[PDB]
Amino acid sequence: QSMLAVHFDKPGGPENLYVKEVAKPSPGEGEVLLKVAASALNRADLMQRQGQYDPPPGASNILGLEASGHVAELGPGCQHWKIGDTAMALLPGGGQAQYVTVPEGLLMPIPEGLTLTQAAAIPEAWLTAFQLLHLVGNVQAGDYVLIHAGLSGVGTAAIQLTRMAGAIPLVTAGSQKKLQMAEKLGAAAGFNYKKEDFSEATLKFTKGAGVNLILDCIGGSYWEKNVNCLALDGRWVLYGLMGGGDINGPLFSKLLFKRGSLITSLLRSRDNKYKQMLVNAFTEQILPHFSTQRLLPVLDRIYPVTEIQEAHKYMEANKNIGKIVLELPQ
Amino acid sequence: QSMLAVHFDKPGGPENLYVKEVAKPSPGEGEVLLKVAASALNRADLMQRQGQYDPPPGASNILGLEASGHVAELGPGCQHWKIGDTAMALLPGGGQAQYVTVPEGLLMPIPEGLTLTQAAAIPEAWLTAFQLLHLVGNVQAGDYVLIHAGLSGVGTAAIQLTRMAGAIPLVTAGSQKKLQMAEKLGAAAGFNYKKEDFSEATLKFTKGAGVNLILDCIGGSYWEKNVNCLALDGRWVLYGLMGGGDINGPLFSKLLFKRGSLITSLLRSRDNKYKQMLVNAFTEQILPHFSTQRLLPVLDRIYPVTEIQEAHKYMEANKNIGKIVLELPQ
Ligand SMILES: NC(=O)c1ccc[n+]([C@@H]2O[C@H](COP(=O)([O-])OP(=O)(O)OC[C@H]3O[C@@H](n4cnc5c(N)ncnc54)[C@H](OP(=O)(O)O)[C@@H]3O)[C@@H](O)[C@H]2O)c1
């Protein structure tokens, strides 16, 4: 069989996005085929669509870093999961489509009480936020954590995970509205990067001690401000370059002066061993809290997958607060 | 009593250095007074003398980040150490003098068989190298470790400690001679930063995988080269800014692409708790290997403390291979 999948022939704007009848993949050894109910947009999608962000080698060229669905088929050497079981997955790509193969290790249960659509807002944002906060930035209770793009899907995951880890989430965002949501999800403070200097506001908030952890998906444009409000021994976790990757200035002096760590994370390009570790770590540590202090997947808009174009337009606009989810015909 | 101590009234060149009769300090609570036999030069001394590098608050304004000597007196509340016991210490300053107080936790035994003078070449270089390699850069067996200023005192410590940890030390240095020493101390490779591009040579040596750990005391001037030859997941340990602290270019893109960590270490500015931890860690893990695969303090020149001027001149010249040690009249 073939399947319906989000597709763009040439990179460029959202205009290039359509849904196409494409080859339904086949489970290789040790993976399941997920019949996707929903996949969410990630920023990676916009950049991949723009042709800046080629997918990882081995990963499928189809958009979609995550998917919730039903275990359709099973590859050889499986393994726990039944054919029919609803699950969500972190994917290296291929989620904005009706099927996607997933190594069963990365399949996560859909938390009791959540819809497939809500669950589609979890894998990427939350495994990343979790990766950033625990594995990479090593957040401890009492840490002040500065979360940029606070109402990105990752941002909104991070705010909550920061709280869950007993840490103090400070967010930035470019919208009055977004900050309000951030506060509603647990942000101890929200700074509007268009309206004030988040560096001076953070030091204010932290009584000059600064932040132990910066989750930075902006990078360059925010670098001076970031190192400035970094605490001594502060982990500065760079995981996006929305504000460019260029640096011009005394980053080394400034970072060294703060005994700073500029730790970079990518998750998409990681190997299975790492993702399974993360996903096992996440499944044990974080996932159960989507049912219970309860973790809330933050969905902004749901689109049918045929409206991928308008979904990308919408995220390109930075209008979304948390996850834009795309629903696949079944 | 007063004592003879290295001193500079105004910062500037080595010309400003003399030995002066200064106040002999008094052990505060929980510290010992060390009668210094030898102290070594560190680069910190040249910068402190130049007035770039003020000493830590609380620390003495006298040069000398280390000292070997004899426990002269004991403060109240001691934790082990007797008055007369020979010991060496990591110091925040005050070592290039006839006495210096030290929290007994930072006093380390002088390895059986080493002279006080040789021991004076250990604390700083080796506690730093150890800090950099284990606590900060977390070296594992099999790691390729790129050590810049390979025949700095730290460099020469690091080469050996890298080997001890089962890691592969690659060094850079600006001297044909220095590389030879580096090889003699265990450097798997030596690159001459004046004669070749250490980035292309390192990738060559590492068959394109690059280095898991860069001990970088140069920083800016070497940054492009450094991130270039960094391995995936590579810790880039910045602990000096000899080659400037300015960055101009896509460090973030390049680092993020390598899932690099730019981790900065300072040791001088650390609190006692940290230094004791480090020193206990070092004393348990590394110190015994100065007697036994045997760790060799690398002394280049010994000067009497009255020749501090010529010692600083000598280090300012980058002529030293390993530690320039200064001996104090007794
Ligand atoms: N490397 C990894 O492991 C990994 C994994 C997943 C995602 N990411 C990255 O994490 C970030 C968010 O991902 P997502 O898909 O959840 O994001 P999203 O849903 O697109 O939200 C991102 C938000 O970034 C903010 N932003 C954009 N440009 C900015 C700028 N120049 N300065 C300040 N803020 C800016 C916008 O909100 P406001 O301006 O209103 O706050 C935008 O809504 C992206 O950089 C993405 O590339 C990284």
Ligand SMILES: NC(=O)c1ccc[n+]([C@@H]2O[C@H](COP(=O)([O-])OP(=O)(O)OC[C@H]3O[C@@H](n4cnc5c(N)ncnc54)[C@H](OP(=O)(O)O)[C@@H]3O)[C@@H](O)[C@H]2O)c1
């Ligand atoms: N932050 C900390 O925790 C800490 C603690 C102790 C020391 N340090 C730092 O570690 C470095 C070495 O300390 P040390 O006292 O052992 O050093 P040292 O005895 O002075 O040796 C340093 C060597 O650096 C090399 N060098 C100088 N400028 C350079 C440049 N622009 N490019 C490349 N190489 C250059 C020179 O040798 P070649 O050019 O011939 O190789 C020089 O001999 C210094 O940067 C010092 O500040 C840091």
